[PDB]
């Protein structure tokens, strides 16, 4: 749904890297350079951003609101 706070395998805090990751993918980095520039060395941290679907941006269009 939303980005998990910590990586499942090691435990590094990944949940703050998401808004920087989309910001670095607006400036036309590749994913391979963006994950390096955010500083995720172990690949268990890298699959938290490489494989994450952001459903809550598209679930919040359906929430009732005033």
């Amino acid at each position: 749904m939303i980005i998990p706070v910590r990586c499942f395998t090691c435990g590094k805090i990944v949940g703050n890297k998401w808004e920087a990751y989309l910001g670095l993918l607006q400036a036309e980095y590749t994913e391979g350079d963006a994950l390096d520039a955010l500083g995720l060395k172990r690949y268990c941290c890298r699959r938290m951003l490489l494989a994450h679907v952001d459903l809550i941006e598209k679930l919040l269009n359906y929430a009732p609101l005033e």
Partner: protein
């Protein structure tokens, strides 16, 4: 909210379905040189009698995909071969076959054989043990045939 426990059935996207058996702490797991201690230890006896070599290639191609931000294709009758992902792994400093030097978490001493790490797409199936555990001491009986 149901959290996975002893009894909750996972799968593997290759028919290697299997119940969870044991939940060990993080400190008791093996670990590479880089400190990665694996989430799911899978038994290597499932592979020779079932010949799921596709899982061994999925693990390799996923490992070679997370290291440089691609998604490799495993399309039927095509897809990214082994000879490309071997070079993609060797460019980043891992072994070209996925096997890694792995230190045991229990004893601290390294292991004799190398261990085959990689990210495999497991998917949790709906058959949980909290919905299947059932018991009856004595209770309601039928009205007609007085048996449970």
């Amino acid at each position: 909210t149901r959290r996975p426990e002893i009894g909750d059935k996972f799968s593997s996207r290759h028919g290697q379905k299997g119940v969870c058996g044991l939940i060990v702490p993080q400190e008791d797991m093996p670990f590479c040189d880089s400190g990665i201690c694996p989430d799911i230890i899978m038994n290597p006896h499932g592979f020779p009698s079932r010949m799921t070599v596709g899982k061994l290639i999925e693990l390799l191609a996923g490992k070679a995909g997370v290291l440089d931000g691609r998604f490799h294709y495993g399309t039927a009758f095509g897809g990214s071969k082994v000879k490309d992902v071997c070079e993609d792994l060797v460019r980043h400093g891992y072994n070209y076959l996925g096997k890694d030097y792995v230190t045991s978490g229990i004893t601290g001493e390294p292991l004799e054989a190398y261990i085959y790490f990689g990210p495999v797409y497991y998917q949790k199936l709906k058959h949980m043990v909290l919905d299947k555990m059932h018991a009856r001491a004595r209770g309601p009986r039928a009205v007609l045939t007085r048996q449970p």
